[PDB]
Design a protein around this ligand. Structure first.
Ligand SMILES: C[C@H](O)CP(=O)(O)O
Ligand SMILES: C[C@H](O)CP(=O)(O)O
Ligand SMILES: C[C@H](O)CP(=O)(O)O
Ligand SMILES: C[C@H](O)CP(=O)(O)O
Ligand SMILES: [Co+2]
Ligand SMILES: [Co+2]
Ligand SMILES: [Co+2]
Ligand SMILES: [Co+2]
Lengths: 193, 193, 181, 181
């Protein structure tokens, strides 16, 4: 359907710029038949580079010519059981820092990246910061006690947060977490959106 | 600042429609001085109804004339301790159904409404549905085992979800929750966004 | 109505943040009956300041509690006859609440001395232009060191949002159609 | 470049979903080195189908992994001279990648028999119009039972997105400026 989506979106864009197969084909160094094939779903082999030229000549982006992420929901819902959970190691400028246990996601809300994060180190003094990431993030301390740092890593804002505490971090705001000094480990829920 | 915001936004809108104090004032049955006062932050007493007429004559909405929600963050962050948590009773077409324990919120992301929801009843047979609400919702089973129902309440999709399970519910999708038959009670995290 | 839209949006928002009439009332120096009344369309007299207070305690903006501009279209269309509409003379063309940012005009440039051009501070929204008659001397960017261009009849241009600009006829009047969107 | 924008967006997305090169490679029948190469700008040869597969396993769309149209503006502006541009004759006016939806035209309506009007199926985007010359007979809505209007020179109109329409000169040619945005 990437090719099918491109077929329909290609036709539409060309129509809105008032071009006919021949008009577009010449600007691209192709034959009007080749263009017809694309609008016929035969554009599956076009390369990223060709898509760029096509987008350029059409005065728009590749995104505008490709379909949305799609629907992976069962009647508007999708669930994830506990064992289906994927795991990824979080080595911050290398030392084991977090453990990312991924929760359910969906192509209907791409920016939603929920996670159960195991905070490994318990020494605030060696907290490893972020640069800040695109997107807001809601957090909840699931277990243990967390020691959070944010803002300027050279002189950051801080907070001791026990179980049940919730937080909100605005996009691009640098942040770092560790368990409270000496408590060994902690766990929080992180929902990026 | 609602009045200050309106002052600046009023000036801007009037400018974009090419009107001068007198032009606008006449269309409104006011004096150009009165308009000047509004653009001077003296519009604090205007009623909702007057704001509507003003918006109408300006060919736009009241929202376009009022400032954004505002910033309540401390360097891009806001936290909420466990005891600061507000509680609200959830009586579904009246019988105690849920208990809403509100988590942190922010005017920088108004649609974010996180919550620890106590699912009170444990009899799926008398699950009380929603009509579906505006907005997506991410869920996580915090404790116990949940019995979820969604879609057509007359013949719904269902799922037994143990601790750790996570779910996603698309906007307007009707849904209902109860603890698993006989398990007494359950608890989940609900993040509306 | 501003009062009916506010009534439904206020109710959606309250419910959205799990607040009952009582809870909300406690935050605004009002009784739950008053709150319920607003949700019944009786909030029409609320002041801007009060609305600001209401949006605040609900953690949102006034705009989120007020209805959109509205619909002034006839089955999707709205028309304006030519009769129903010192640097410039703005002859305002058709407008609509279904697209507030659309502000089309036929502008008369009465001046023709480029060095006497007066820049605007730049404005929100993009702007398409078309030289309808005469020649135009366009200036944009920084007024102290601006880019310039001579535009003849038939010429079309686009100036991006917030980019300051100025117009005059070419040295020694001009008419153009400008469309903000 | 499409390959450089894809390189950074692909990397942001992978990191955003907590995936390392190895994890992503395992999902696309590629080695982690190949993945790292794409993030080094070497994905230029990837096919549309492959891109579709990449967006899929990353739970998003191709558009989210590809750069925006780009910037063809001169300090915020772009100009078009009058020379650089059977129902209609479209004389395309200035366009720009900073606002793809903007498609201004000077349209020549060569026909003048309203009952021979041919509706379009409606198109995305709003459209402002201005009768530049002659008289126009406008039709819109359902082609089987459409609304109609006689528009004289100077008249301006707005047709909302997806509303089907048709134009011809008044019974017994016309020229107008149309702006899609
Ligand atoms: C909790 C943290 O926000 C996890 P990160 O976004 O830094 O990977
Ligand atoms: C968990 C449920 O989603 C709580 P509701 O949105 O129905 O109030
Ligand atoms: C007049 C101002 O100086 C510029 P405009 O409002 O035409 O964009
Ligand atoms: C020509 C088509 O029939 C209508 P347009 O593309 O001018 O909107
Ligand atoms: Co983070
Ligand atoms: Co819900
Ligand atoms: Co302007
Ligand atoms: Co059209």
């Amino acid at each position: 359907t990437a090719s099918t989506g491109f077929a329909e979106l290609l036709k539409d864009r060309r129509e809105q710029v008032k071009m006919d197969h021949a008009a577009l084909a010449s600007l691209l160094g192709e034959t009007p038949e080749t263009v017809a094939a694309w609008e016929n779903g035969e554009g599956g082999e076009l390369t990223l580079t060709q898509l760029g030229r096509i987008a350029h000549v059409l005065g728009t982006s590749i995104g505008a010519l490709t379909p949305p992420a799609g629907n992976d929901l069962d009647d508007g819902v999708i669930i994830q059981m506990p064992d289906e959970r994927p795991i990824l190691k979080g080595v911050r400028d290398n030392v084991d820092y977090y453990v990312y246990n991924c929760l359910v996601r969906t192509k209907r809300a791409p920016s939603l990246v929920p996670l159960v994060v195991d905070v490994l180190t318990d020494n605030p003094d060696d907290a490893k910061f972020n640069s800040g990431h695109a997107g807001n993030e809601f957090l909840f301390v699931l277990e243990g006690e967390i020691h959070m740092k944010w803002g300027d890593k050279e002189n950051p804002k801080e907070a001791l947060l026990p179980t049940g505490a919730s937080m909100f971090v605005e996009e691009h705001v640098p942040h770092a977490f560790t368990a409270a000094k000496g408590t060994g480990s902690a766990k929080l829920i992180a929902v990026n959106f």
